[PDB]
């Protein structure tokens, strides 16, 4: 875990860019605009509130490490993703069409690049009348 905190402190140094040891909303927005994204202030606020437990408005390095620590391949996260698919499931049998999925990835919420979805579909066995088992995806992307 020493290499882990070495890499995490390296990562925190990118945002810090100071001996501050904290990150402010702008201090994140600058790094994001460096990539050509253009977030909103409300976006960065809601972003930042999901890391701190101090209620200050800034991320101390322990909180940054804490966010790193907790795992995506989780009991609860898996079920949340699974429940999210079910909104788009007609008949609730555990299957969804292909073209419907492509329609939903590329239009609703954060729209995706077409090549991204082209990759996404072919991760799963899409044949079989075009249906796909979405728990296959869930097991895939909760494998880490």
């Amino acid at each position: 875990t020493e290499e882990q905190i070495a890499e995490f402190k390296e990562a925190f140094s990118l945002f810090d860019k100071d001996g501050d040891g904290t990150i402010t909303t702008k201090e994140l927005g600058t790094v994001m605009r460096s990539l050509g994204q253009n977030p909103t202030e409300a976006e960065l606020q809601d972003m930042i509130n999901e890391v701190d437990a101090d209620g200050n408005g800034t991320i101390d390095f322990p909180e940054f490490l804490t966010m790193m620590a907790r795992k995506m391949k989780d009991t609860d996260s898996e079920e949340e993703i699974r429940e999210a698919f079910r909104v788009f499931d007609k008949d609730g049998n555990g299957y969804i069409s292909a073209a419907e999925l492509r329609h939903v990835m590329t239009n609703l919420g954060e729209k995706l690049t077409d090549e991204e979805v082209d990759e996404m579909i072919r991760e799963a066995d899409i044949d079989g009348d075009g249906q796909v088992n979405y728990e296959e995806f869930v097991q895939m992307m909760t494998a880490k």
Binding site: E10, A11, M47, G109, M141
Partner: protein, 348 residues
């Protein structure tokens, strides 16, 4: 395969007027067979019903076993239950266990007790037991268990306090009444057990009258007990009724939450993006347009996008509240203040 899911919906996800008539008729025939189980106990009709209940039992074991295997096949529509181990998982669930037990035990008692006392003694209990077949997905019991778990502290409180009141008050009634003799000559309260029987029958407002106190101490205590303890065995009705109602209504109003769709999509998208990050050869890198340390920061930002999307989704499914109004008002208000200050400076 369309037919398979179609019959699954017919049997196991019912809706409409055909499905309803089917499940209705099933309920009615099982109830009728129960009434023959009743009338088998009466001496006048113990012969008629006893014979009738041997042929209807055969009819029913055939019918329910058939329905069982049809259902066990039709469960391949669900992806949980595809495959052999899937069907095994289907047989594993409780209602299927009960159905199977009923079918097999019917068949056994018929094939054995053909040539028979314990036979019919068991038949009657199977007839009773078959009523669990009706509720298929257990929404009944699930509702109950939910409301009990939510309101567990209240109910334990009532049970404790009422129990104590019963115990104490019944001891004192025993002491006051242990030597009293009835008009018919007998002693109602010989023991503390009898006083507890009295107390149970009383505090819960049944009043058989098999045991009544005669003395003035007993009547005094009983009056006060009867006025001040009975409530604690009547609260659960109010509690559970309000719980049932609230649960149903909110589970219904949850249907009209339409904001959850983009939240779900965003959650999915950012999750898969976090995953595909772990393949540097992926095509999710082209969105940003060399990359000594850009890798790490992108991964970090995506992870926290995932977390915020997760919380937003988890709250997208719940009803709004005043707290949310206040939060958004303050947020937008301060945004507006900083913006008008910004313009105020841009002029200068």
């Amino acid at each position: 395969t369309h037919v398979q899911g179609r019959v699954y919906n017919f049997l196991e996800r019912p809706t409409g007027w055909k499905c309803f008539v089917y499940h209705f008729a099933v309920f009615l025939i099982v109830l009728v067979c129960l009434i023959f189980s009743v009338l088998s106990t009466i001496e006048q009709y113990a012969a008629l019903a006893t014979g009738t209940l041997f042929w209807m039992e055969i009819v029913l074991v055939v019918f329910f076993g058939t329905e069982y295997v049809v259902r066990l096949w039709s469960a391949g529509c669900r992806s949980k239950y595809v495959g052999l181990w899937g069907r095994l998982r289907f047989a594993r669930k409780p209602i299927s266990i009960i159905d199977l037990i009923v079918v097999v035990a019917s068949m056994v008692v018929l094939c054995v007790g053909s040539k028979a006392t314990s036979a019919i003694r068991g038949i009657r209990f199977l007839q009773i037991l078959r009523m669990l077949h009706v509720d298929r997905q257990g929404g009944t019991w699930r509702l109950l268990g939910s409301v009990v778990f939510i309101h567990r502290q209240e109910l334990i409180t009532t049970l404790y306090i009422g129990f104590l009141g019963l115990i104490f008050s019944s001891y004192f009634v025993y002491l006051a009444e242990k030597d009293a003799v009835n008009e018919s000559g007998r002693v109602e309260f010989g023991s503390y057990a009898d006083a507890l029987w009295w107390g149970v029958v009383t505090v819960t407002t049944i009043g058989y009258g098999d045991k009544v106190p005669q003395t003035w101490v007993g009547k005094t205590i009983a009056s006060c007990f009867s006025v001040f303890a009975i409530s604690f065995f009547a609260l659960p009705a109010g509690i559970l009724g309000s719980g049932f109602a609230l649960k149903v209504q909110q589970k219904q109003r949850q249907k009209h939450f339409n904001r959850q769709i983009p939240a779900a999509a965003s959650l999915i998208q950012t999750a898969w993006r976090c995953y595909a990050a772990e393949n540097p050869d992926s095509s999710t890198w082209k969105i940003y347009i060399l990359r000594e340390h850009h890798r790490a920061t992108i991964k970090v930002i995506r992870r926290m996008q995932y977390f915020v999307a997760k919380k937003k989704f988890q709250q997208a499914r719940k009803p709004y509240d005043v707290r949310d109004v206040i939060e958004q008002y303050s947020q937008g208000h301060l945004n507006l203040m900083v913006r008008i200050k910004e313009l105020q400076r841009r002029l200068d």
